[PDB]
Design an enzyme around this catalytic site. Structure first.
Site, short mmCIF file in Angstrom:
data_model
loop_
_atom_site.label_atom_id
_atom_site.label_comp_id
_atom_site.label_asym_id
_atom_site.label_seq_id
_atom_site.Cartn_x
_atom_site.Cartn_y
_atom_site.Cartn_z
N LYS A 1 62.81 40.33 -92.09
CA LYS A 1 63.40 39.42 -93.07
C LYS A 1 64.73 38.85 -92.58
O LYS A 1 65.00 37.65 -92.74
CB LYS A 1 63.58 40.14 -94.41
CG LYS A 1 62.27 40.39 -95.20
CD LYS A 1 62.43 41.38 -96.38
CE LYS A 1 61.05 41.91 -96.78
NZ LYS A 1 60.96 42.66 -98.07
N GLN B 1 65.17 46.76 -101.07
CA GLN B 1 63.91 47.11 -100.44
C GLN B 1 63.38 48.38 -101.08
O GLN B 1 64.10 49.38 -101.21
CB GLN B 1 64.08 47.29 -98.93
CG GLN B 1 62.77 47.45 -98.17
CD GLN B 1 61.96 46.14 -98.06
OE1 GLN B 1 62.47 45.05 -98.26
NE2 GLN B 1 60.68 46.26 -97.73
N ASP C 1 63.26 38.46 -104.98
CA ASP C 1 61.94 39.07 -105.03
C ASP C 1 61.17 38.75 -106.31
O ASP C 1 59.94 38.91 -106.32
CB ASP C 1 62.05 40.59 -104.87
CG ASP C 1 61.88 41.03 -103.42
OD1 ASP C 1 61.42 40.21 -102.58
OD2 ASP C 1 62.22 42.18 -103.11
C1 LIG Z 1 58.57 46.64 -109.01
N1 LIG Z 1 57.60 45.96 -108.12
C2 LIG Z 1 57.10 46.49 -107.01
N2 LIG Z 1 57.45 47.73 -106.60
C3 LIG Z 1 57.14 48.22 -105.38
C4 LIG Z 1 56.85 47.44 -104.25
C5 LIG Z 1 56.54 48.03 -103.02
C6 LIG Z 1 56.53 49.42 -102.92
C7 LIG Z 1 56.20 50.05 -101.72
O1 LIG Z 1 56.30 51.28 -101.58
N3 LIG Z 1 55.66 49.26 -100.80
C8 LIG Z 1 55.22 49.79 -99.51
C9 LIG Z 1 53.81 49.28 -99.21
C10 LIG Z 1 53.89 47.87 -98.56
C11 LIG Z 1 54.33 46.74 -99.54
O2 LIG Z 1 54.44 47.03 -100.77
O3 LIG Z 1 54.50 45.60 -99.04
C12 LIG Z 1 56.24 49.38 -98.42
O4 LIG Z 1 56.84 48.30 -98.60
O5 LIG Z 1 56.41 50.16 -97.46
C13 LIG Z 1 56.81 50.19 -104.04
C14 LIG Z 1 57.12 49.60 -105.25
N4 LIG Z 1 56.27 45.64 -106.44
C15 LIG Z 1 56.25 44.55 -107.22
C16 LIG Z 1 57.07 44.75 -108.26
C17 LIG Z 1 57.22 43.79 -109.18
O6 LIG Z 1 57.96 43.92 -110.15
N5 LIG Z 1 56.57 42.64 -109.08
C18 LIG Z 1 56.80 41.62 -110.12
C19 LIG Z 1 55.61 41.26 -110.98
C20 LIG Z 1 55.28 39.92 -111.19
C21 LIG Z 1 54.20 39.56 -111.98
C22 LIG Z 1 53.46 40.58 -112.54
CL1 LIG Z 1 52.09 40.24 -113.52
C23 LIG Z 1 53.79 41.91 -112.33
CL2 LIG Z 1 52.86 43.11 -113.06
C24 LIG Z 1 54.87 42.28 -111.55
C25 LIG Z 1 55.75 42.44 -108.05
O7 LIG Z 1 55.14 41.38 -107.95
N6 LIG Z 1 55.58 43.40 -107.13
C26 LIG Z 1 54.68 43.17 -105.98
N1 LIG Z 2 58.63 47.02 -100.17
C1 LIG Z 2 59.28 45.85 -100.69
N2 LIG Z 2 60.42 45.95 -101.43
C2 LIG Z 2 61.03 44.80 -101.94
N3 LIG Z 2 60.50 43.57 -101.70
C3 LIG Z 2 59.33 43.49 -100.97
O1 LIG Z 2 58.72 42.29 -100.69
C4 LIG Z 2 58.74 44.66 -100.47
N4 LIG Z 2 57.54 44.50 -99.72
C5 LIG Z 2 57.63 44.09 -98.35
O2 LIG Z 2 58.70 43.87 -97.83
N5 LIG Z 2 56.34 43.96 -97.70
C6 LIG Z 2 56.16 43.56 -96.34
C7 LIG Z 2 55.17 44.09 -95.65
C8 LIG Z 2 54.95 43.67 -94.20
C9 LIG Z 2 55.74 42.77 -93.65
C10 LIG Z 2 55.49 42.40 -92.20
O3 LIG Z 2 56.30 41.75 -91.60
N6 LIG Z 2 54.26 42.88 -91.57
C11 LIG Z 2 53.93 42.61 -90.16
C12 LIG Z 2 53.78 43.98 -89.48
C13 LIG Z 2 55.13 44.69 -89.59
C14 LIG Z 2 55.12 46.14 -89.05
O4 LIG Z 2 54.31 47.04 -89.42
O5 LIG Z 2 56.01 46.46 -88.22
C15 LIG Z 2 52.59 41.88 -90.02
O6 LIG Z 2 51.62 42.16 -90.76
O7 LIG Z 2 52.41 41.03 -89.15
C16 LIG Z 2 56.89 42.17 -94.45
C17 LIG Z 2 57.08 42.53 -95.71
#
Ligand SMILES: Cn1c(Nc2ccc(C(=O)N[C@@H](CCC(=O)O)C(=O)O)cc2)nc2c1c(=O)n(Cc1ccc(Cl)c(Cl)c1)c(=O)n2C
Ligand SMILES: Nc1ncnc(O)c1NC(=O)Nc1ccc(C(=O)N[C@@H](CCC(=O)O)C(=O)O)cc1
Ligand SMILES: Cn1c(Nc2ccc(C(=O)N[C@@H](CCC(=O)O)C(=O)O)cc2)nc2c1c(=O)n(Cc1ccc(Cl)c(Cl)c1)c(=O)n2C
Ligand SMILES: Nc1ncnc(O)c1NC(=O)Nc1ccc(C(=O)N[C@@H](CCC(=O)O)C(=O)O)cc1
Lengths: 283, 284
Positions: free
Chosen positions: B53, B97, B120
């Site tokens: 990012k 994050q 976000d």
């Molecule tokens: C509170 N939050 C969360 N938490 C959250 C996110 C990631 C992880 C994590 O561990 N993520 C791991 C797995 C990879 C990934 O997630 O990319 C990681 O990053 O390592 C743990 C918790 N993700 C949300 C919201 C939220 O508020 N919103 C607004 C929203 C908008 C419209 C509707 Cl309808 C709804 Cl329901 C909600 C969202 O869009 N997302 C998507």
């Molecule tokens: N957790 C959060 N908390 C707050 N706001 C959020 O948005 C998130 N979620 C993320 O940030 N999700 C996310 C997942 C993957 C990538 C990405 O760059 N993926 C690469 C491989 C990277 C690697 O594994 O090194 C690829 O697929 O090419 C970027 C953002």
């Protein structure tokens, strides 16, 4: 044959539950709750629905007023009335009946109702709270559909639910409640768009354990579209008679449960609004 | 054989558009946009994503800082830091994050970020605005999935979309955008539930013109689940020691009409849309 669920009868006993909660709250020394409804213009459907709401408020011991205004009022005048009712400590619940005339921004109006008085759940923060399961007040129609399913005992956990929506405002809140981690419903949910042809919807409906039709299209749901003994919930309101979305005589032969129109979801909407109003009065 | 959509290539176009938008904005005498990221603890995936990012921010002309805190931070100090950055007029965008340590309530944290800076879109206000089509900013991953579909030109109107979500937060916003009246796809959308039977999901995927898998299980989506010409979008993130998506890529590559790889697909699009959200926030 399909068992018919009387929405009217179930709503009437929910109202009896609200009445005793209201009479308890007042005997305990608290102000009697008051619901204010703003009705703008002359839409005959709106006037009928508001009449059913204020009748129900009387049945359950909640004071109420309908404030009727002409369709020529301006947005600023409507906002001034809402601000007045927001600041009136006698008013616990406040809702604006929709639709409003085109010169009034409906979204600005709903966001002007105090979130604590927003017994319809239309304020943007209450919508956000509902999506995040952070809520205390659910919109009346989706909550009423949920109560029908729950109080009847129809299983949802891991079942297939199809919602046919006239608009996102109608189908999505219903699916939101039914899809959510266990309210909550823990079900796979389809939300069908009105631009999906009936033939494609059929391939979704035939798989569904629960079909919820809110499309405003007569005879959209017919017996060929329903697996045997599914639950069919008719939310459509269609107009010299009044009909739902479902071929009632048709799918009565195949469904396991069915709701009629009138006398189904309509009365439950009104009953859940009374629930929200006692909730609002206690906050 | 399926077209393979390059997330890297589309993200590059989107980042080029943001850079031009940023330089014009600065050219007119405005403050350069600034994004602050709060990163708590030592989750290696989180650090990798935050670095992606802030690298993207620099190359589009957006200033950035990552504030790293140890996992043993209290909820009160995290709230105090967020309140400081809410009131810092140099800060246009603020994101925390996720995930956070278990002793910290993430919903309280997300609601503490100023809605005007919530790039976000996780604040309860902005969840509501997204539902009601009042928004300025959209969650980056849902918006990224939409741009992949829209920019590739895959039709959505009245089509069948299946979203296989690991939780409501993941699947619902994607489904919401695609169901919305035309962002917005006018599509019928199925939201399969966590732990749904693979054979139960098969019954819905078979009908789908667009399959969006965001469940985080390898090989969820095999060829026997897809109809020919369908678009398959892989949002899954899995470690099996290497990163893979939810799709059996080589198998589905024969069956599908379109497919996104992991890595190189949705990932870079998520990062790129955050850049859009940050210039939007700086413009107020
Ligand atoms: C509170 N939050 C969360 N938490 C959250 C996110 C990631 C992880 C994590 O561990 N993520 C791991 C797995 C990879 C990934 O997630 O990319 C990681 O990053 O390592 C743990 C918790 N993700 C949300 C919201 C939220 O508020 N919103 C607004 C929203 C908008 C419209 C509707 Cl309808 C709804 Cl329901 C909600 C969202 O869009 N997302 C998507
Ligand atoms: N957790 C959060 N908390 C707050 N706001 C959020 O948005 C998130 N979620 C993320 O940030 N999700 C996310 C997942 C993957 C990538 C990405 O760059 N993926 C690469 C491989 C990277 C690697 O594994 O090194 C690829 O697929 O090419 C970027 C953002
Ligand atoms: C703004 N609004 C509206 N307006 C609206 C309603 C009716 C008519 C009309 O013409 N109605 C017809 C028929 C009415 C009927 O369906 O019975 C009439 O009576 O003439 C026109 C406009 N209906 C909403 C929301 C809203 O905000 N919410 C919160 C919400 C919660 C979660 C989610 Cl996810 C979403 Cl998206 C939205 C909702 O639940 N409903 C249901
Ligand atoms: N528009 C809105 N603006 C603000 N907040 C709202 O909640 C709404 N929506 C409603 O108020 N929806 C509604 C629809 C039908 C009935 C109803 O009473 N139906 C009866 C009688 C049938 C008839 O009178 O035609 C039945 O089905 O038996 C009640 C409420």
């Amino acid at each position: 044959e399909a068992v018919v669920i009387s929405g009217r009868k179930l709503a009437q006993q929910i109202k009896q539950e609200v009445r005793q909660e209201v009479e308890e709250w007042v005997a305990s020394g608290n102000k009697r709750p008051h619901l204010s409804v703003i009705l703008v213009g002359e839409n005959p459907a709106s006037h009928s629905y508001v009449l059913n709401k204020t009748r129900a408020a009387a049945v359950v011991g909640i004071n109420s007023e309908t404030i009727m205004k002409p369709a020529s009022i301006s947005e600023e005048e409507l906002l001034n009335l809402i601000n007045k009712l927001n600041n009136d400590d006698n008013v616990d619940g406040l809702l604006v009946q929709l639709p409003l005339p085109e010169h009034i921004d409906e979204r600005r109006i709903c966001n002007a109702v105090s979130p604590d008085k927003d017994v319809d759940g239309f304020h943007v923060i209450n919508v956000g709270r509902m999506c995040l399961d952070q809520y205390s007040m659910l919109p009346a129609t989706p909550w009423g559909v949920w109560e029908i399913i729950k109080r009847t005992g129809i299983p949802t956990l891991g079942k297939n639910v199809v919602v046919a929506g006239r608009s996102k405002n109608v189908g999505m809140p219903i699916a939101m409640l039914l899809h959510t981690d266990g309210p909550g419903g823990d079900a796979t949910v389809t939300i069908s768009h009105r631009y999906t042809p009936k033939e494609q919807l059929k391939k979704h409906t035939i798989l569904a354990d629960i079909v919820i039709s809110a499309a405003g299209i007569p005879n959209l749901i017919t017996a060929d579209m329903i697996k045997e003994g599914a639950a069919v919930i008719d939310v459509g309101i269609n107009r010299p008679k009044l009909v739902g979305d479902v071929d009632f005589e048709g799918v009565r032969q195949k469904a396991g449960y069915i709701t009629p129109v009138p006398g189904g979801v309509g009365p439950m909407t009104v009953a859940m609004l009374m629930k929200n109003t006692i909730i609002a009065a206690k906050k």
